[PDB]
Design a protein around this ligand. Structure first.
Ligand SMILES: OC[C@H]1O[C@@H](O[C@H]2[C@H](O)[C@@H](O)[C@H](O[C@H]3[C@H](O)[C@@H](O)[C@H](O[C@H]4[C@H](O)[C@@H](O)[C@H](O[C@H]5[C@H](O)[C@@H](O)[C@@H](O)O[C@@H]5CO)O[C@@H]4CO)O[C@@H]3CO)O[C@@H]2CO)[C@H](O)[C@@H](O)[C@@H]1O
Ligand SMILES: OC[C@H]1O[C@@H](O[C@H]2[C@H](O)[C@@H](O)[C@H](O[C@H]3[C@H](O)[C@@H](O)[C@H](O[C@H]4[C@H](O)[C@@H](O)[C@H](O[C@H]5[C@H](O)[C@@H](O)[C@H](O)O[C@@H]5CO)O[C@@H]4CO)O[C@@H]3CO)O[C@@H]2CO)[C@H](O)[C@@H](O)[C@@H]1O
Ligand code: 40S
Ligand code: 40S
Ligand code: 40S
Ligand code: 40S
Ligand code: 40S
Length: 180
């Protein structure tokens, strides 16, 4: 893929929650559930704007708590998020530190979704007392996602993944070079 980013429609991921996604890396926020995806999958770097993950919708399913591996539920609900943001390698190595040298994070996962609290996704996805999970993701039509996109924050903002074909088909396009 352009830039050496690692971008696939379905796979295994870890999951955490974060807040403050009103000025996200794609340059448009959204009112439905949203997430940041790890940098290696996002397709950009801090400051460079939108990458090719932008606007794509994914069904996320948490099925394991790696910090308490004998917990077997209840988990949260499967949710559909729209990717609006970038979870950078910097400062977030445990979960978002996938790079060309180390394509899996500390939980052995090649992808990570950081689900934004601001529009409620994390409240549905994480059971009380279990704020970090592993499980699966699958790219789905954004017709399965509920919400509306926000206005552009800056020129070149992009959420065109919302109607593009599944990865590895492209949409917004990658910027720069994959983290190494
Ligand atoms: O006018 C000059 C030129 O501007 C071009 O637009 C600029 C724009 O001015 C600038 O504001 C914009 O900045 C983006 C930046 O590109 C993007 O990487 C950044 O993404 C952040 C995001 O806001 C955070 O939510 C996210 O938080 C993470 C935490 O940092 C992390 O610790 C962890 O908790 O995980 C969080 C995410 O889960 O970090 C992201 C990555 O840093 O957002 C900025 C604000 O939107 O950049 C654009 C593009 O360069 C314009 O295109 C051009 O035409 C014009 O001439
Ligand atoms: O960088 C990405 C993103 O991170 C967000 O912050 C994350 C952070 O990165 C994670 O490390 C953190 O993970 C914590 C879990 O949310 C939390 O549920 C888990 O709690 C454990 C607890 O530590 C553990 O000791 C406890 O064990 C109990 C057993 O389960 C019981 O059976 C037994 O009886 O008793 C023991 C002792 O109590 O289990 C629980 C559940 O597993 O701890 C993790 C480590 O602290 O999650 C954060 C939120 O997602 C950050 O918000 C974002 O800004 C950032 O972008
Ligand atoms: C203002 C939020 C969306 C409201 O629907 C953006 C994330 O903070
Ligand atoms: C200089 C940045 C914007 C600061 O608001 C973008 C490039 O990192
Ligand atoms: C405000 C929460 C639910 C609204 O019904 C999340 C949406 O931001
Ligand atoms: C990137 C925005 C930050 C808002 O807090 C400014 C440009 O719209
Ligand atoms: C950028 C487009 C993908 C082209 O196949 C999306 C059109 O909305």
């Amino acid at each position: 893929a352009t830039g050496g980013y690692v971008q696939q429609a379905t796979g295994q991921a870890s999951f955490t929650m974060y807040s403050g996604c009103g000025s996200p890396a794609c340059g448009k926020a959204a009112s439905g559930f949203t997430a940041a995806i790890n940098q290696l999958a996002f397709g950009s770097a801090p400051g460079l704007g939108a990458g090719d993950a932008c606007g794509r919708c994914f069904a996320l399913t948490g099925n394991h708590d790696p910090y308490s591996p004998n917990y077997t539920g209840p988990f949260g609900q499967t949710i559909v998020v729209k990717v609006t943001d970038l979870c950078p390698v910097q400062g977030n190595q445990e979960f978002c530190g996938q790079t060309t040298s180390n394509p899996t994070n500390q939980h052995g996962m090649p992808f990570h979704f950081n689900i934004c609290e601001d529009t409620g996704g994390s409240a549905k996805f994480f059971p009380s007392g279990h704020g970090a999970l592993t499980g699966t993701f699958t790219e789905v039509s954004c017709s399965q996602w509920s919400g509306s996109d926000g206005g552009q924050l800056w020129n070149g903002a992009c959420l065109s993944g919302e109607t593009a074909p599944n990865w590895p088909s492209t949409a917004c396009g990658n910027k720069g070079t994959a983290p190494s």
